Design a protein around this nucleic acid. Structure first.
Ligand SMILES: [Zn+2]
Ligand SMILES: [Zn+2]
Ligand SMILES: [Zn+2]
Ligand SMILES: [Zn+2]
Lengths: 199, 199, 199, 199
DNA sequence: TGACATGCCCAGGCATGTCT
DNA sequence: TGACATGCCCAGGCATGTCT
């Protein structure tokens, strides 16, 4: 069992928050975000664009870390890992096969295994938006379904995104729930309806 | 891809056939056999008793081999193995972790990996029935569900039981289909009803 | 997992059979036998008298062995042992603390752990009945309840009694089911009624 | 028999009190707290989150200790230990197999056996809440059911949580009753109804 | 001896990747 | 996109040592 990183929102002095793209109505759209649930629904190994928005410019050398933790109290102290089947399959060259979350399209990506907690994380440099743009987008990939036997095993996860200075100070923190599934559109609509009818 | 052992019934000069125990009506009974389908339905890692019946006594040194093959033509040439999750879990001390089929309660069990075909099999000596008894019973275990991702992946298998002399001559061959599943009683009654209504 | 001793009745050339005493009607009588079920119901650590009847006199040096096996196919290959709580408690001086079945009142008792199967058994010399008597009685004790967690765990057992010559030849074999429980009278009456109503 | 640690509430100069999470309505929810009974109902080996609330910040080096005692006067002087079955089973690497209470997800956990009283306790450093949060949460696990034969044996326990400075001074003490059981929701609703109807 | 105890058994139906 | 798949969740009630 491992000590649990905080998931508490800390928008901080830089006004850090996340944004998500709108997507289509298909039963099996690749990535769709529910604001009511603060929850991403996405397919295995497909791009999940996450926007980073800030009110003030972070200092040079700021880093963006993503980490998954189990959402339920009963599972929080268990490290989130890829299942043995997917670990044994699809390497991009940098991500260790045991890591659930990857970043695509970034030459400065770093995959970390915490020496004390054993938890996995993936870090890229923070880059400010281009001229006229309001945010910076990172493309994450989740390499197992929420349902994978021997991995997440139908346990919901949170992704925690932290903005950190080069010294390691926490500048901001946000999180979102993730369901990696075959039919994100179906499952988002089911969970939203259950929220309305039974929540 | 691997060459495919015969599944053709050969009751042979010893009159070799299989028998199966009757079991209870529970939705999740541990092992239940359908004569109409020639199909065992059983749970993961639970005992599956298979009876060996002969009309004539096999010679000393006769051996009994069990091997799984996929039933569908499209999958026949693929070796049946345990999935990575269950391989990484439950060793009894003798069975290699990759083997699907084990025998319990036999000190002379041998687990074989074919040098040419890569197929797994498990062998025990043939023992004649005790006085007054009509058959000999072997207790097999199947160490994955038929549905296991990265293993059988919802593909039906046959188990091929061969009676072999010590020289390697085939004396008899029988086979039965297997579904390893959580609810053998439910699934047997579903498959028998589908046979009657749509077969 | 361990190879399974035969439980098949073999009354043999000596006409070997078991007999049991009649007992009282109390809900918690110490030992009561159901002929309809061929099943002893008895309390923990209390005397269970078992009679040995023969038609012909066994040879000098004949031995009487008792051994427990799980009755259900799914558990047959598991060695029957005392639970950790009762193992750690009540030694008579001869019985190893892991043995379920003891014999009381016999100076020539031998407790055996099979080198290959790991199964426990308890052996006493066969003694012919005294003049005018028809049988010989052995007093067995069962040192766990059928329900004990970490031991029998609510799994029914059979006791197998074998008559063996000094050379090791099997002269006769009989068996009976056992439920060790707090209320043998209650439980016998429940199981007999269930047999009549639902069997 | 062992001297009995105090269970008297002492909220102390730091205003120390416990808090508990709300949980779902399921018959077998993993952990549910009854304010009317000051009683946790939880399952074996599952996470039990306990919140530590203070009004004033404890000094550096403060420690949080948990210990179980039997609630009934007749059993208070008996040390609460794991039963022999569960002791012989599930080690996390740090907890001795005899200890009932474990802490998950803390690298600084210490398991203590008192030299004089023989009582077990588990200690972690006190950490103040993160920014904006009102409490600190510890995840305890209870490694036997209240009913375990040879352990708690259906005797209710209190868990005593003490806040202690590094010098050993008692800063605060709170306690709650615990029932570790298979069906916490069922049993909580039974005990609350008995309180209302017969208390 | 009656009846409470409490972990477990059991059937109904949700789950969710995949078939069509 | 509709609907089958199939391991799992869940509540009702049996279990069985013990309390009275
Ligand atoms: Zn996976
Ligand atoms: Zn598997
Ligand atoms: Zn016992
Ligand atoms: Zn226990």
């Amino acid at each position: 069992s491992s000590s649990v990183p905080s998931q508490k929102t800390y928008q901080g002095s830089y006004g850090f928050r996340l944004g998500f793209l709108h997507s289509g109505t298909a039963k099996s759209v690749t990535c769709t975000y529910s604001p009511a649930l603060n929850k991403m629904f996405c397919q295995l190994a497909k791009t999940c664009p996450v926007q980073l928005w800030v009110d003030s410019t972070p200092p040079p050398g700021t880093r963006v870390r993503a980490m998954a933790i189990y959402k339920q109290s009963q599972h929080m102290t268990e490290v989130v890992r890829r299942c043995p089947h997917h670990e044994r399959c699809d390497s991009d060259g940098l991500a260790p096969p045991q890591h659930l979350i990857r970043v695509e399209g970034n030459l400065r990506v770093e995959y970390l295994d915490d020496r004390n907690t054993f938890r996995h994380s993936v870090v890229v440099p923070y880059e400010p938006p281009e001229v006229g743009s309001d945010c910076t987008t990172i493309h994450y990939n989740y390499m197992c379904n929420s349902s994978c036997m021997g991995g997440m095993n139908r346990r919901p996860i949170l992704t925690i995104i932290t903005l950190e200075d080069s010294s390691g100070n926490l500048l901001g923190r946000n999180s979102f729930e993730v369901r990696v599934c075959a039919c994100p559109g179906r499952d988002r609509r089911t969970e939203e309806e259950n929220l309305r009818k039974k929540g």
